[PDB]
Amino acid sequence: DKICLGHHAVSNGTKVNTLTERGVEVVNATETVERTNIPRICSKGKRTVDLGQCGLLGTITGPPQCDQFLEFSADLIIERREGSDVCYPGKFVNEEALRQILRESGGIDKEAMGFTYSGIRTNGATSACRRSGSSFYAEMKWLLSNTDNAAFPQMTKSYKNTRKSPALIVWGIHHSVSTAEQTKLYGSGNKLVTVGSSNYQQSFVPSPGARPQVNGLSGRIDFHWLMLNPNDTVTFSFNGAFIAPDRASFLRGKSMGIQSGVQVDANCEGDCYHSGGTIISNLPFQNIDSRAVGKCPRYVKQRSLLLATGMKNVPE
Amino acid sequence: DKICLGHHAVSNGTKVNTLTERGVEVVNATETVERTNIPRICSKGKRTVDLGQCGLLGTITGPPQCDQFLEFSADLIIERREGSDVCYPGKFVNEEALRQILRESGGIDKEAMGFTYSGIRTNGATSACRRSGSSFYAEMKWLLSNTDNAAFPQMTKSYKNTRKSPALIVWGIHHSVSTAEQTKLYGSGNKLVTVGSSNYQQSFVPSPGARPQVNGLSGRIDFHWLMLNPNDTVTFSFNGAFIAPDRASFLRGKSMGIQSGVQVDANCEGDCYHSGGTIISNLPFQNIDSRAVGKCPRYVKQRSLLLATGMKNVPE
Amino acid sequence: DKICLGHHAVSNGTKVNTLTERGVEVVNATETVERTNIPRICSKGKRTVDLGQCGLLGTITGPPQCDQFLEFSADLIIERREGSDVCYPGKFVNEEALRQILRESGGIDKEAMGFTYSGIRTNGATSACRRSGSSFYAEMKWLLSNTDNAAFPQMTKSYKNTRKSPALIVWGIHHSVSTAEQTKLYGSGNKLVTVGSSNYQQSFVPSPGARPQVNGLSGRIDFHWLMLNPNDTVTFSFNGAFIAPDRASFLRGKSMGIQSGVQVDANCEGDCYHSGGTIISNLPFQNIDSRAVGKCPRYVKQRSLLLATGMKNVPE
Amino acid sequence: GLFGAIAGFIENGWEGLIDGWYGFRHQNAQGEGTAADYKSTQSAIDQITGKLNRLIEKTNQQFELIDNEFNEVEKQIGNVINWTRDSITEVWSYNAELLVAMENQHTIDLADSEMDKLYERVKRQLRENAEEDGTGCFEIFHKCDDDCMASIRNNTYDHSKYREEAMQNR
Amino acid sequence: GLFGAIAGFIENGWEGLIDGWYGFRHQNAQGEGTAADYKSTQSAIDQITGKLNRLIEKTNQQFELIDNEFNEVEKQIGNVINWTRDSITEVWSYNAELLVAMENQHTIDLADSEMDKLYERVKRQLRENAEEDGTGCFEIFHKCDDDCMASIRNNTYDHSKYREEAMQNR
Amino acid sequence: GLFGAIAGFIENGWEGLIDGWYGFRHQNAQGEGTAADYKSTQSAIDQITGKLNRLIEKTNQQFELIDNEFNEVEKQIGNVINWTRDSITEVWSYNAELLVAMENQHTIDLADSEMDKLYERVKRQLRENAEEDGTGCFEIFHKCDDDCMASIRNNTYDHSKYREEAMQNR
Ligand SMILES: CC(=O)N[C@@H]1[C@@H](O)[C@H](O[C@@H]2O[C@H](CO)[C@H](O)[C@H](O[C@]3(C(=O)O)C[C@H](O)[C@@H](NC(C)=O)[C@H]([C@H](O)[C@H](O)CO)O3)[C@H]2O)[C@@H](CO)O[C@H]1O
Ligand SMILES: CC(=O)N[C@@H]1[C@@H](O)[C@H](O[C@@H]2O[C@H](CO)[C@H](O)[C@H](O[C@]3(C(=O)O)C[C@H](O)[C@@H](NC(C)=O)[C@H]([C@H](O)[C@H](O)CO)O3)[C@H]2O)[C@@H](CO)O[C@H]1O
Ligand SMILES: CC(=O)N[C@@H]1[C@@H](O)[C@H](O[C@@H]2O[C@H](CO)[C@H](O)[C@H](O[C@]3(C(=O)O)C[C@H](O)[C@@H](NC(C)=O)[C@H]([C@H](O)[C@H](O)CO)O3)[C@H]2O)[C@@H](CO)O[C@H]1O
Ligand SMILES: *[C@@H]1O[C@H](CO)[C@@H](O[C@@H]2O[C@H](CO)[C@@H](O)[C@H](O)[C@H]2NC(C)=O)[C@H](O)[C@H]1NC(C)=O
Ligand SMILES: *[C@@H]1O[C@H](CO)[C@@H](O[C@@H]2O[C@H](CO)[C@@H](O)[C@H](O)[C@H]2NC(C)=O)[C@H](O)[C@H]1NC(C)=O
Ligand SMILES: *[C@@H]1O[C@H](CO)[C@@H](O[C@@H]2O[C@H](CO)[C@@H](O)[C@H](O)[C@H]2NC(C)=O)[C@H](O)[C@H]1NC(C)=O
Ligand SMILES: *[C@@H]1O[C@H](CO)[C@@H](O)[C@H](O)[C@H]1NC(C)=O
Ligand SMILES: *[C@@H]1O[C@H](CO)[C@@H](O)[C@H](O)[C@H]1NC(C)=O
Ligand SMILES: *[C@@H]1O[C@H](CO)[C@@H](O)[C@H](O)[C@H]1NC(C)=O
Ligand SMILES: *[C@@H]1O[C@H](CO)[C@@H](O)[C@H](O)[C@H]1NC(C)=O
Ligand SMILES: *[C@@H]1O[C@H](CO)[C@@H](O)[C@H](O)[C@H]1NC(C)=O
Ligand SMILES: *[C@@H]1O[C@H](CO)[C@@H](O)[C@H](O)[C@H]1NC(C)=O
Ligand SMILES: *[C@@H]1O[C@H](CO)[C@@H](O)[C@H](O)[C@H]1NC(C)=O
Ligand SMILES: *[C@@H]1O[C@H](CO)[C@@H](O)[C@H](O)[C@H]1NC(C)=O
Ligand SMILES: *[C@@H]1O[C@H](CO)[C@@H](O)[C@H](O)[C@H]1NC(C)=O
């Protein structure tokens, strides 16, 4: 006598939100916000450099813990909490800009500046920089006066970048424990260091005094930098307190840089990274870390947003 | 013989916009952009500090107009146009970063640095800083040479932050009206001031000369600052032109800071503030001030966007 | 016996994307992402200044290539690759902030500072700045000591902005090829230059040394600036190495600034510009240049997004 | 409207209907009356208020100052801030304009739907007793006192009771 | 489509219909003809052009340069700018993709709706004179010369005129 | 739902229907059976999976670090970054909330539509053989063995075969 029409239903429906309602039950739904983290840096198929105890900036100047990283090559660069840019207490002017540059460099390739010295000592060292005995920064040279208290000859040294891409140049200013100790190294009177590229001018006067003990030592070195363009020349006019660049660095290509405290893993592949690991997901959004880098779902404040994949559930 | 079906209608409909039309008349609509301002800072239930004539940065160094604000405590901090960070003409290096810090500090708590002096005068003052007679910044001390033209002993003073959170440290460089007047205060020859925290290095050389008259006075003081971390030590090496910190500040917790020119009001409560007052609204958007701070509707350029709360109106 | 109902269709339908499908064929569609560029700066009806060989900042100081731009007036300002801010090798401190200011100034109007000198030479020049013979920056004056090696009298010069809007003030520090050459111009001993506005304090010590040859010359000039407010006074205390402002600049009103390498054209009108030309479009979005300025469609990564302007196509 | 009822085959609304959103005006031997359908009315109202709740649900995020209205910040960093803020203003102004237009379209169609739902329900009650007019009206062949019309409104109208007579009255 | 007419119970469209969007192809003793329904056609067109106006309504905001294509800005501040701009680019690329998809869905359904609206109107004109085919066709029991079919198209067709004869022709 | 079928004139769904989304439960002299309509079921499924593909289609943009979790960046520039990031977070959180709500509404209505499409198709097959119940059921006047009911499900049911007898059985 009859034929009825109907639709399916389930005992257990999944609740979702609409334009009109909150918690309307539908047949089936699927999550759109990713919460699952892999607690490892998923590095399968990528040239990876885990800096460990080496600080990214320390790859340019080369303290002992960066000896194995002086000319590295990478698609992915991992910075560790324990990493350190210096052996002899110091600081980089514009540290973070230079980091951002090195993070996406694809690594670095070094080339001798070809500086040659006459009238000064260039083998200065320290117990802070240990290579089985006192030493110094591998890529640098600590410039002095030949004998204690001796004068410093006003000096003009130049480097022309003859290559096709710009050269990262780095030099260091020394700050001795006393006003007395700056005179010992480089003679009395106030010394001047200046730098002149075709698109750059700046000046540097040392500032001796008594800092607190770091690595046992109370002196400091200021590191500085500029990118020197093709067929441009940088000139170093100085009279002391100067730490001299021996090699200039060049950037290899492209990479990505991250900061983490989890292990590396060549078994899983991912392109979205944060300090706690890797977000492997096809979901449009994520609620794991708003500072995740690489190619990631968009961060959102919501923990979950369920998307209906079925009709409304109408049981009973 | 019949039963007709129909829907309601009104003589006066409200016009709205759709995907397809502009100004389609519907039965009823409601606004979604807030235009109503309360012209008062609605502060009910909040620890509020209205700085008045005191400048936020002046709470750290303490000119006379900030004497009652040296250790304040707040959920909400209100800066006034008339507020002033200095009595003796001066300026803060990085003023705005330090403001942003103090705005969300929850206020400050001061602790004696415990500096102790031998060989110099520390009671320097001025007519600009009036506490019934010439005076100076409450939290600071103006360091000198014992007698006119006398030398300045090269000095090494240190403070270790022994507490669990970082300490805001502030010191001031003095710039006298002449090259002659810098010699009077601190003796001739060029003086040096430097600062060395485990994550910080910088140097300060004074710069005497003739500025224009402010508060009647033509000299200036440069104020400077760093956050000193737990179990780290800051060292002050100097030879003159230095204004010495007596207390170090610590941040109490959390707050919000705003700038306004309207009265405070403990009768109304709000969480969205601007300089003209308070936005009390549940509407998703606002067209009042795009720089409103706190927890606010999103600013939008549109004055009004009407949302239909009824069917289309079809009269006659 | 019958009447059928139907809808239209076409042999050639346009494919589009929906919420549910990709490449569903509809009757007709229209593009929403603009790809068409006009390869010219469309300047119809606008006061336009094409700086050509003059650098925007060079309009303030006035090297020879900016002689015709010293008091310009504009709605639209065009910077060229070939443009140059200097004749005698130099650099602006805060160059880009000052550019952004000048780009939207509406141009500039100059007014004599009224500085008057006694005890020094003020006619210094160079072969780099050619006006049929050696010369200097039109708006500036190169200050010296009357005779070679002579002293420099400690000098206090002031300007009060008496006008209703703030004055752009610019002065230049000179850096000579030697420590010997700074003494020739301005006598030996270390010179000091300082600047004091009611909301500004800074100091400038010269830094002689050997830079590389630019325009044939190996010295440099540092240019600096501040905006001086109505009824405020700027004071210049100095002892040498100082390049003196002769006129102060004032901003005329409003403009827009762009950078380009295509021709100007008064036949077409546009309000969206980039370096390759003009985007003339009513489309909500564009895929031409994400750095386009003016009033433009929103840049999007997609090359094309087709919007259905007809029903689904169902042929055969 | 998408469903072709409101401003559609129903030529216009009723200003006399102040009791609900949708209703009936009958006509018979006993004269004209009117009423409101609660069920249909409430289903539109509850959906509409559902939208409102959704857009008044705004526990917002804190933002602090990053510039200064009394002491202008350094100019470079000022222009970056202003550019960002203006870019965000543009996004939100777009979002708000689209939200309300998008929502308003749905509202109008939603109310159109509910009217159609009520209409078809009624048609489904009167199986061959009444026939369609086209103005939004059901012409009844068998007669209906105020008791009948109230039975339709209450969902209690029995088609089999008046079947044969209306059938033949065709 | 949401309303089940276009690409639905109407198997396909007409390429011969160049006169409007929706129309009639009749059949009778006098042969086949065709025409266009203006009212329905115009209601889709006017709605569609309403969308277009809406998306071409763009009095835009001014933005200035905050970086430099000839003289690269300081690197830190350059990377903040680029990050912001890329973030804004992402938002807009999403917004545009969603807008057009969202709009395109509605367009398709909207045209589907209008066809259904026209269909049901016609059904409502022929009360028991015609019956439903299912392909989108009304089989008429009483005969209809070109004068009749034009009366339907003009909204002038009177069901009571041909009632009894079509009724019995069942 | 917008089309008034699901949670509408169909009072509830069938938990016994595990074979598809939409289907038939018949009743006749030979007893009750049940089945699934593939065509209708697949059209909802394919539309729904179309949405999913659309939201899993995310070849994303690269972003790098602009701040530092180990060595805090200068404070001014830190607060600008954080303000920007929080502003972008707000936009996306809004976008995601709106997308899913907007999408979920459509899904529900879309499934409601397909049920209605199937319903009306069937009605269109049984021209005056059956009449409408109102619960989502067609009462058949002429009898139908399991062969008949399968003919309806296959789109092969011929109304003219059982016309006169069902007509008179009225
Ligand atoms: C820790 C303690 O008990 N007393 C400190 C003492 O450390 C410090 O003298 C320094 O002692 C350390 C060892 O802890 C080094 O041996 C320093 O010597 C060197 C160095 O290793 O760096 C030797 C090196 O050859 C010197 N090189 C040059 C080029 O000059 C350097 C260098 O001069 C200084 O690092 C620059 O200031 O020093 C030794 O200085 C003293 C000094 O303040 O203070 C005790 O209290
Ligand atoms: C305004 C006028 O008629 N003539 C100015 C004159 O102001 C200025 O001398 C200053 O005069 C003011 C009063 O207007 C003060 O009395 C200054 O004296 C003090 C001060 O109050 O600040 C006294 C104080 O004890 C001094 N303290 C120390 C530690 O040295 C200070 C201090 O030296 C200076 O502030 C630093 O430069 O000064 C008094 O200097 C003169 C000086 O240029 O110029 C007239 O034209
Ligand atoms: C290029 C070469 O063969 N030898 C350089 C030589 O250029 C350089 O001396 C400079 O020579 C150039 C010409 O190429 C100028 O003539 C310089 O003279 C002037 C100038 O034109 O700028 C003259 C001017 O009157 C001087 N003005 C003042 C106010 O002093 C300036 C000025 O002193 C300097 O520009 C500032 O340093 O110089 C002339 O200096 C020499 C010097 O290092 O080096 C050869 O190798
Ligand atoms: C950034 O924009 C603000 C406004 O949002 C500008 O500040 C305003 O400037 C106008 C004219 O210059 C004044 O009339 C107002 O008093 C200012 N308003 C506020 C709230 O500050 C500001 O100048 C812009 N910044 C830069 C660097 O150009
Ligand atoms: C920010 O992005 C811009 C592009 O939007 C980068 O500038 C481009 O750099 C590439 C290669 O470095 C060049 O080929 C182009 O000529 C540049 N284009 C423009 C428009 O400037 C820029 O390098 C980025 N900034 C930083 C600091 O990394
Ligand atoms: C900007 O926000 C970040 C977090 O996004 C702040 O950094 C966190 O600070 C809290 C407390 O200060 C710490 O517990 C976390 O370890 C920090 N997290 C990260 C990821 O860095 C940061 O302080 C903010 N910056 C400024 C200048 O206020
Ligand atoms: C199914 O029902 C159980 C009730 O015990 C509940 O815990 C679970 O979350 C439900 N899950 C789904 C997907 O419906
Ligand atoms: C329901 O959705 C899930 C994802 O949440 C999916 O994997 C699965 O295909 C669906 N399950 C059923 C029983 O339909
Ligand atoms: C650098 O100079 C050499 C000639 O020595 C030339 O081959 C090259 O093109 C120059 N490069 C640039 C960027 O000017
Ligand atoms: C009602 O109509 C009056 C006409 O005098 C008009 O001023 C008013 O704005 C209307 N308001 C609403 C809400 O319809
Ligand atoms: C119409 O909307 C307003 C808000 O605009 C609301 O307060 C009120 O409930 C509604 N008024 C009527 C008469 O329905
Ligand atoms: C600071 O040092 C003390 C020991 O004197 C210790 O209790 C505390 O853990 C240290 N704090 C930090 C942050 O290293
Ligand atoms: C029309 O069809 C031709 C096939 O030759 C194709 O090249 C063209 O792109 C089509 N254009 C449109 C708008 O349908
Ligand atoms: C189809 O759309 C185009 C824009 O893409 C428009 O110019 C034109 O009016 C339409 N053409 C036809 C034949 O309908
Ligand atoms: C500047 O001072 C003059 C009086 O000399 C006065 O007319 C004007 O109001 C003042 N302007 C400001 C901004 O204080």
Checking DSSP bridges between strand B285-286 and strand B33-34, what pairing results, if any? parallel
Checking DSSP bridges between strand B272-274 and strand B293-295, what pairing results, if any? antiparallel
- Is B309 within 8 Å of chain A by CB? no
In contact, A80 and A50? CB cutoff 8 Å: yes
- Burial of B118 from C-beta contacts in 10 A (0-12 / 13-18 / 19+): exposed
Q: How many CB atoms lie within 10 A of CB A149?
A: 12
Nearest CA to B16 out of D111, D18, F4 is that of D111
The nearest alpha carbon in chain B to D10 belongs to B6
At B214 the three-state DSSP class reads: strand
Closest ligand 13 atom to C13 CA: 14
At E98 the three-state DSSP class reads: helix
Checking DSSP bridges between strand A298-299 and strand A277-278, what pairing results, if any? unpaired
DSSP character at residue E4 = S
Q: How many CB atoms lie within 10 A of CB B45?
A: 9
CA of E80 to the centre of ligand 4 (A): 22
Across the interface, whether the CB atoms of F88 and E83 are under 8 A apart is answered no
CA distance between the termini of chain E: 33
* Residues of chain B contacting F76 with CB distance shorter than 8 Å: 94, 96-97, 100
∠ Cα E23 E28 E31 (to 5°): 85
C311-to-C70, D105, E115, E136 alpha-carbon distances in Å: 61, 19, 10, 17
Q: Is the CB of A190 under 6 A from ligand 9?
A: no
At B309 the three-state DSSP class reads: coil
- Is F11 within 8 Å of chain D by CB? no
D16: left (phi over 0), alpha (psi -120 to 50) or beta: alpha
CA of F100 to the centre of ligand 9 (A): 57
In contact, E7 and C312? CB cutoff 8 Å: yes
> How far is the C-alpha of E15 from the C-alpha of C315, rounded, in Å?
7
Which residue lies with its CA nearest to atom 4 of ligand 6? F82
Q: Is the CB of A233 under 6 A from ligand 9?
A: no
Method: X-ray
Q: Is the CB of A230 under 6 A from ligand 9?
A: yes
In contact, A234 and B221? CB cutoff 8 Å: no
Across the interface, whether the CB atoms of F50 and C301 are under 8 A apart is answered no
The CB-side HSE value for B195 (13 A sphere, CA atoms) comes to 21
- Is D89 within 8 Å of chain C by CB? no
Nearest CA to C126 out of C173, C52, C63 is that of C63
In contact, F64 and A271? CB cutoff 8 Å: no
Across the interface, whether the CB atoms of B97 and F90 are under 8 A apart is answered no
In contact, F21 and F128? CB cutoff 8 Å: no
Which residue lies with its CA nearest to atom 29 of ligand 1? A124
In contact, D32 and B3? CB cutoff 8 Å: no
What one-letter code names the amino acid at B65? Q
Q: How many helices (H) and strands (E) does chain E have?
A: 4, 5
> How far is the C-alpha of C78 from the C-alpha of C263, rounded, in Å?
10
Interface of E with F in 25-64 (CB under 8 A): none
C295-to-C273, C299, E93 alpha-carbon distances in Å: 8, 12, 18
Two tokens at C131?
């006006």
Across the interface, whether the CB atoms of C201 and B190 are under 8 A apart is answered no
Two tokens at C130?
């050619």
Which DSSP helix (H) or strand (E) runs through E54?
A: helix E38-56
Interface of A with C in 171-200 (CB under 8 A): 190, 192, 194, 196-200
In contact, A246 and A261? CB cutoff 8 Å: no
Q: Which chains touch C (3 or more CB pairs under 8 A)?
A: A, B, D, E, F
* Residues of chain F contacting E86 with CB distance shorter than 8 Å: 61, 63
> How far is the C-alpha of A153 from the C-alpha of B247, rounded, in Å?
45
DSSP character at residue D154 = T
Which DSSP helix (H) or strand (E) runs through C238?
A: strand C233-238
Q: How many CB atoms lie within 10 A of CB A146?
A: 11
> How far is the C-alpha of E37 from the C-alpha of E41, rounded, in Å?
6
DSSP 3-state helix, strand, coil percentages of chain F (rounded to 5)? 55, 10, 35
What one-letter code names the amino acid at B189? G
Q: C16 — phi, psi (to 5°)?
A: -140, 170
Across the interface, whether the CB atoms of B207 and C192 are under 8 A apart is answered yes
Q: How many CB atoms lie within 10 A of CB A142?
A: 21
Q: Which chains touch A (3 or more CB pairs under 8 A)?
A: B, C, D, E, F
Probe target for ligand 2 pocket from B87, B126, B148, with the most ligand atoms within 8 Å of CB: B126
> How far is the C-alpha of A268 from the C-alpha of C294, rounded, in Å?
46
What one-letter code names the amino acid at E20? G
Residue pairs between chains B and F whose CB atoms are closer than 8 Å: 14
* Residues of chain D contacting A20 with CB distance shorter than 8 Å: 47, 50-51, 54
CATH architecture type of domain F1-170? Alpha-Beta Complex (3.90)
* Residues of chain A contacting B158 with CB distance shorter than 8 Å: 212
In contact, C129 and C63? CB cutoff 8 Å: yes
CA distance between the termini of chain D: 33
Checking DSSP bridges between strand C14-16 and strand C2-7, what pairing results, if any? unpaired
> How far is the C-alpha of D125 from the C-alpha of D37, rounded, in Å?
15
> How far is the C-alpha of F42 from the C-alpha of F49, rounded, in Å?
10
Looking at the DSSP bridge assignments, the partners of residue B220 are: B175
Two tokens at D138?
């059901």
Closest ligand 6 atom to F68 CA: 21
> How far is the C-alpha of A257 from the C-alpha of A293, rounded, in Å?
9
Across the interface, whether the CB atoms of B301 and E106 are under 8 A apart is answered no
Interface residues of B toward F, Cβ cutoff 8 Å, are 94, 96-98, 100-101, 199, 298
Greatest Cα-to-Cα distance within chain D, rounded to the nearest angstrom: 91
Q: Which of E92, E136, E139 sits opposite C5 (nearest CB)?
A: E136
Two tokens at A200?
């750059």
> How far is the C-alpha of B272 from the C-alpha of F148, rounded, in Å?
70
In contact, B226 and B201? CB cutoff 8 Å: no
DSSP character at residue C214 = B
CA of F14 to the centre of ligand 5 (A): 61
* Residues of chain B contacting D146 with CB distance shorter than 8 Å: none
In contact, A315 and A8? CB cutoff 8 Å: no
Residue from A57, A99, A100, A285 whose CB has the most chain E CBs within 10 Å, to mutate: A100
Burial C116-134 (b: 16+ CB within 10 A, else e): eeeebeeebebebbeeeee
CA of C257 to the centre of ligand 5 (A): 19
> How far is the C-alpha of A303 from the C-alpha of D70, rounded, in Å?
40
Nearest CA to C194 out of C186, C184, C202 is that of C202
> How far is the C-alpha of C8 from the C-alpha of C28, rounded, in Å?
12
Domains and CATH numbers, chain C: 1-46+263-316 (2.10.77.10), 47-262 (3.90.209.20)
Two tokens at C132?
């049929």
Rounded to a whole number of angstroms, the distance from the CA of C209 to the nearest CA of chain A is 6
> How far is the C-alpha of E65 from the C-alpha of C103, rounded, in Å?
9
At C64 the three-state DSSP class reads: helix
DSSP character at residue B87 = S
In contact, D110 and D2? CB cutoff 8 Å: no
* Residues of chain B contacting C238 with CB distance shorter than 8 Å: 209
Greatest Cα-to-Cα distance within chain B, rounded to the nearest angstrom: 118
> How far is the C-alpha of C237 from the C-alpha of C158, rounded, in Å?
9
Rounded to a whole number of angstroms, the distance from the CA of E121 to the nearest CA of chain F is 16
Q: A95 — phi, psi (to 5°)?
A: -55, -45
Checking DSSP bridges between strand B14-16 and strand A298-299, what pairing results, if any? unpaired
Q: Which residues line ligand 5 (CB under 6 A)?
A: C 291; E 69, 75, 78-79, 82
Resolution, Å (one decimal) = 2.8
Across the interface, whether the CB atoms of D9 and E167 are under 8 A apart is answered no
* Residues of chain B contacting F74 with CB distance shorter than 8 Å: 97
Two tokens at F13?
């769904």
Q: How many helices (H) and strands (E) does chain B have?
A: 3, 29
Rounded to a whole number of angstroms, the distance from the CA of E167 to the nearest CA of chain F is 13
The nearest alpha carbon in chain E to D79 belongs to E66
> How far is the C-alpha of E66 from the C-alpha of E47, rounded, in Å?
41
Q: Which of B175, B210, B220 sits opposite C156 (nearest CB)?
A: B210
Which DSSP helix (H) or strand (E) runs through B33?
A: strand B33-34
Beta-strand runs (E) in B205-261: 220-228, 233-238, 242-245, 247-251, 256-259
What one-letter code names the amino acid at F100? V
Closest ligand 5 atom to E79 CA: 27
* DSSP string computed for chain A: -EEEEEEB--SSPEEE--SS-SSEEES-EEE-EE-PPBSSEEBTTS-EEE-TTB-TTHHHH--GGGGGGTT-B-SEEEE-TT-BS-SSSEEETTHHHHHHHHHTS-BEEEEE-----SSS-----EEEEESSSEE--TTEEE---SSTT-----EEEEEE--SSSPEEEEEEEEE-SSHHHHHHHH-SS---EEEEETTEEEEE------PPPBTTB--EEEEEEEEEPTT-EEEEEESSSEEEE-EEEEE-S--EEEE-SS-EESSSB-SEEETTEE-----SEE-S-TT-EEE-PEE-S-S--EEE-SPBP---
The nearest alpha carbon in chain F to E76 belongs to F66
Contacts of F168 (CB under 8 A, 6+ apart): none
Contacts of F166 (CB under 8 A, 6+ apart): F128, F129, F130, F140, F141, F142
- Burial of B21 from C-beta contacts in 10 A (0-12 / 13-18 / 19+): buried
DSSP character at residue C68 = G
- Is C311 within 8 Å of chain A by CB? no
Burial A169-194 (b: 16+ CB within 10 A, else e): bbbbbbbbbebebbbebbbeeebbbb
Two tokens at B216?
């009647």
Sign of CA dihedral A128, A129, A133, A135: negative
